[PDB]
Amino acid sequence: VRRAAVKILVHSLFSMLIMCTILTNCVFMAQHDPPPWTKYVEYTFTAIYTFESLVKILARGFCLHAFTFLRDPWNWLDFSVIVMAYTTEFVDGNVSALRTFRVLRALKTISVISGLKTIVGALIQSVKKLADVMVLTVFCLSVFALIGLQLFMGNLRHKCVRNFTELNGTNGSVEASLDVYLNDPANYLLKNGTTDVLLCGNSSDAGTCPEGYRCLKAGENPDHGYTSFDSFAWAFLALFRLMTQDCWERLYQQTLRSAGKIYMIFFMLVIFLGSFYLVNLILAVVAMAYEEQNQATECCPLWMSIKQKVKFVVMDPFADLTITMCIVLNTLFMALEHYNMTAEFEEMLQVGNLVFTGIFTAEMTFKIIALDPYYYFQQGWNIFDSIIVILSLMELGSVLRSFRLLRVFKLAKSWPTLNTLIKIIGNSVGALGNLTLVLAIIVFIFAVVGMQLFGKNYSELRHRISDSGLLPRWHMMDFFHAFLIIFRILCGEWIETMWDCMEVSGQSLCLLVFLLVMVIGNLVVLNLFLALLLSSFGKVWWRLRKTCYRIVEHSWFETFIIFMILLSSGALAFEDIYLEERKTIKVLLEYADKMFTYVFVLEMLLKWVAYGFKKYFTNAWCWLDFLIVDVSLVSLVANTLGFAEMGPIKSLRTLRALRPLRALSRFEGMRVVVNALVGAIPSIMNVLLVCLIFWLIFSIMGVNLFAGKFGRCINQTEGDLPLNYTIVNNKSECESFNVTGELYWTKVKVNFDNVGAGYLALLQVATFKGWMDIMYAAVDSRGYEEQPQWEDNLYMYIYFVVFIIFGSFFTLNLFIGVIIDNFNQQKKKLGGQDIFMTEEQKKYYNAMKKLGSKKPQKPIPRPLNKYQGFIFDIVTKQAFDVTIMFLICLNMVTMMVETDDQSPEKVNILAKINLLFVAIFTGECIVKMAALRHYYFTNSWNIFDFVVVILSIVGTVLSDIIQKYFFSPTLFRVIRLARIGRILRLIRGAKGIRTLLFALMMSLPALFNIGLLLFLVMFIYSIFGMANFAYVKWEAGIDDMFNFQTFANSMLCLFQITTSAGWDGLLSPILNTGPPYCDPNLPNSNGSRGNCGSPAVGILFFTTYIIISFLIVVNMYIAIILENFSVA
Amino acid sequence: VRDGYIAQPENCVYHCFPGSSGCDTLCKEKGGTSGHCGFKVGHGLACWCNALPDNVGIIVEGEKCHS
Ligand SMILES: *[C@@H]1O[C@H](CO)[C@@H](O[C@@H]2O[C@H](CO)[C@@H](O[C@@H]3O[C@H](CO)[C@@H](O)[C@H](O)[C@@H]3O)[C@H](O)[C@H]2NC(C)=O)[C@H](O)[C@H]1NC(C)=O
Ligand SMILES: *[C@@H]1O[C@H](CO)[C@@H](O[C@@H]2O[C@H](CO)[C@@H](O)[C@H](O)[C@H]2NC(C)=O)[C@H](O)[C@H]1NC(C)=O
Ligand SMILES: *[C@@H]1O[C@H](CO)[C@@H](O[C@@H]2O[C@H](CO)[C@@H](O)[C@H](O)[C@H]2NC(C)=O)[C@H](O)[C@H]1NC(C)=O
């Protein structure tokens, strides 16, 4: 029987039997609320699994041999599942968590498929690569969590609570003490237009409660209780959130609303260093790991005559160009679809549709009968063409016509980049097919794990997870919705559903599973991304001329014009909505503007007479300056000689905001960075066209599926979708009930009603900032003009799933692929070695590299004293500094174990330990100064310890005083934590982290230049919006503090947008033009009337900014990763 | 009289000096007779005096240092 066991084990039939077994068990696990009909299918499954385990044991056929075939790491899984099944079969006791363990079988797929186990094994190694960088990032996250803790400890608890504590409540229990001030959230103030407590602050920057509401700290808890910055656990959670950018704009707005606008500095340090740089180096170490991994490997005459006739037809096909143009025209034709087509236009569209079906049928028949039917049986391209023909034919006798768009893809033959996107989509299920399969298995496992662990809780505790009593739009009861939750988490939106699951299930289990799916799923998604990437690869005339040449070549003149453009930029920045408030500066800046026009046109004439129209106009930045001065001169001459205040008066002067653009011509950093940017426009453009066509496909599909199905008819009394089944069924129905004008049939802001609005919705979905209301109104949609039913058409979520996949994971993949291609090409063509560094920045790069030499000086001289020699010999052992670092880590932990309103005795003990620690550090400092003599001047970590010792001794005294009108004065003790870098240098084990941080130091200047250009862009666009978007109605993303009404507010909004965050929330109040949201005439502090935004210029502004900032930050990432590859 | 370190208006600490002669005069000014150095944890060095009536204050803890 031993030989039989062996010969059936090596046999391949029972392996596929096991495969089908696992897969059917999968289809049964993914089933929720199964009938008792199934209670024996699980018995059969246990029988088959136990049979397989038997076969294995017999196949080895001994005691130590059976120990060898259970020595395998995977077979432990089969043993565990069979014993757990026997457990739940034999005896009860019942905790309902053992029934969850059935998901462990789905992992057996990894063991039965050939490369699956190998893929997962090679993936585990990536975690062994990520160990040191994970230590590094948890170190930084903890440091920044301490910073944000001391900064906003119990600050998010601030609430705009109605004023209280009136008079003699015996003692203070008078409200008409803490009992009411806490149980009175109805007496808190909720942010208008939302359901969210309104924060506030002492400082003279933060939110401003209206009359009848005062600022306090008597807040029950944060939004759900999981965002507070006190209790360093919660602060570590919040900063992991800020590092993954998940809903980070929300925490940003809340904090700035509570503490004060100055702390945008903290948030921008976190975003531009924690989020940006740390996420980049995580990605870079994963990419270096995977790079190393990839490196690891009827009659004869009539028959012959008609054959020669069809051959004479064949010799002149001349169709590829004509057929291609017919394809392009067919797409262009279907694109002319929209929401309200008149009946004759629909008839014309359908006529052209039938015409093109006929054309392609003619082509198919001519091709199969003319060249060879067997060749068109062979060549896969023509195979899929004929498939499209058959599909169109089935259509002509919804999704029926949605197959026509596949015809677009044959343009790939003439379009090498669309063919590269095709290569990528093919490799997705090709060389990376088993990796995609790992991903699918993981998403399945996690969906069913979450559904088992959380479905009963989701269904029973619905009341506390949804306001209008119904299901939540995201849950894990079904398997489709659990797949959707796992998808969301894969896209980066997990905190907003983790809050739900923790409010339903509980902190511990939900936190565990959601952090696990975040880490593992994002890891495998990153691995798939990176794998796809790496797989896709008289005399007075000349006298005056000489004088003017000396002037223009005079350094003082250049610095003068620099000062002048900076002053002009400031003058721009002084253009808020408060100029009517201050009449003097109005005229001051008027004179200033005239002076600017004069000096810049004078510089223009001077450069003219110095260099001449030819050698002047041969350059570009001078052309730019010429354009700007021309705009200013047109403005001036139109302001002087009337004929203004009717045409492009202000509507034309707002181009003044282009004034800062003179900076880039002169600052040596902006100029080289823009030279790197424009030098890749010929490579961003073709790829933007590929993405435009590939999103044209999806937008036409969305016009087919959704056009007209987005209008929702809400009454003015409420504010959201009227009855699903009844009340106002159709648009033609809601108008029948408008007998009172309370009801409006309004489309959703961003919809599918054209190819343009389709492009807008596709961008909002592909950036994942706004795709929530898109998907909601799209799946809710049932009829062409009928009210959307709360969850009908549920499987249209698959549209956005397949879009997000192709139009984002693959289009962005093409983006980054071609960007890497173009930049690796630029690296060789560039005269220098690496871009983004000026000559002086290059010099500083070389000098910092010469500094970063690991060769120290001589060890130490001898003090020649007996006692001093003893102290030196005891002070200069490695173990001493180990004790010192243990002390500083204990101080760190002492600074982790405090919260707000902790305990008075606790504050006393903590202060005592603070003094005790500064005493220990003064002691080690004086002992190192008495080591021999030279601690004061030998090493840099020693002088760092010295200066922090001095500052700590200074600390407590002014720390008493500067708690207010300043941040927490104990914050300065966090600097002591920086000393762990010394032992990080003096250890031997963890060494890649050293090179990582040094590469950050190397990439700091490039990031400086790029962020300087980004600051300039934020500046230009903030002035653009302060001219344009001022007075816009305050709505979803544009608050009473995040605004365009000033320059501070505009810089705030611009910064939050810079990371793509919340830009849907800023756009959505721009677009709304008309009632009931908007109004007619309005008395503004400025002549411009209308609290609306121009949809044209609004979409232009926001989309162009999204794309420009996207390219800029991708070049930031590029500099970072090219340095990380140089140090590789 | 109340015994303790002398605050700084309003709710703060005063400051000591390397000698018992620094703040003796300060106790004389607010109504203090004795004088020597003192230490308030969390707020820092002050100067301790006695025989201070309730018309003047001492180091009161809990709110903040505000002047
Ligand atoms: C904004 O600034 C004002 C002015 O300093 C703060 O007013 C004071 O705040 C405290 C709490 O921080 C209020 O409560 C007091 O607490 C102590 C200790 O429990 C108690 O002995 C007092 O009788 C009182 O209950 C205090 O009443 C309040 N001052 C007044 C005149 O009402 C305010 O707290 C600051 N808000 C924030 C959010 O920081
Ligand atoms: C839009 O919805 C209305 C509301 O049902 C439908 O029009 C008719 O409405 C009456 C009102 O009860 C029904 O009795 C009829 O059965 C409806 N017509 C049909 C054909 O069923 C119809 O679905 C839509 N009408 C229009 C004009 O679009
Ligand atoms: C129901 O009636 C109201 C008013 O009778 C309509 O509101 C008007 O909507 C148009 C749409 O552009 C505006 O131009 C008008 O200014 C609005 N009038 C107001 C606000 O008094 C409303 O559109 C109607 N709804 C439907 C579905 O027909």
Numbering used by the authors:
A (entry chain A): 121 to 212, 214 to 297, 304 to 424, 699 to 798, 806 to 945, 1190 to 1780
B (entry chain B): 1 to 67
Q: Could you share sentences copied from the article?
A:
Eukaryotic voltage-gated sodium (NaV) channels generate the inward sodium current that is responsible for initiating and propagating action potentials in nerve and muscle. Eukaryotic NaV channels contain four homologous, nonidentical domains composed of six transmembrane segments (S1–S6), organized into a voltage-sensing module (VS, S1–S4) and a pore module (PM, S5–S6) with two intervening pore helices (P1 and P2). A triple hydrophobic motif, Ile-Phe-Met (IFM), located in the DIII–DIV linker, serves as the fast inactivation gate. Because of their high affinity and specificity, scorpion toxins are used widely to study the structure and function of NaV channels.
In this work, we elucidate the molecular mechanisms of voltage-sensor trapping and block of fast inactivation by α-scorpion toxins in the context of a functional native toxin–receptor complex by determining the cryo-EM structure of rat cardiac sodium channel NaV1.5 in complex with the α-scorpion toxin LqhIII at 3.3 Å resolution. At the C-terminus of LqhIII, Glu63 interacts with the Asn329-linked glycan from DI-PM, and Lys64 dips into the aqueous cleft and interacts with Gln1615. Mutagenesis studies mapping Neurotoxin Receptor Site 3 revealed a negatively charged residue in the extracellular S3-S4 linker that is conserved among NaV channels and is critical for α-scorpion toxin binding. In agreement with those studies, the conserved negatively charged residue Asp1612 at an equivalent position in NaV1.5 mediates this crucial interaction with the bound toxin. His43 and His15 wrap around Asp1612 like pincers forming a hydrogen bond (~2.5 Å) and a potential salt bridge (~4.0 Å), respectively. Remarkably, LqhIII binding drives DIV-S4 approximately two helical turns inward to form an intermediate, partially activated structure. Importantly, in the toxin-bound intermediate-activated state-reported here, R1–R4 adopts a 310-helix conformation, with the last helical turn of the S4 segment relaxing R5 into alpha-helical form. To reach the intermediate-activated state (blue) from the fully activated state (grey), S4 of DIV-VS moves inward ∼11 Å and pushes the DIV S4–S5 linker inward ∼4.6 Å through the formation of an elbow-like bend.
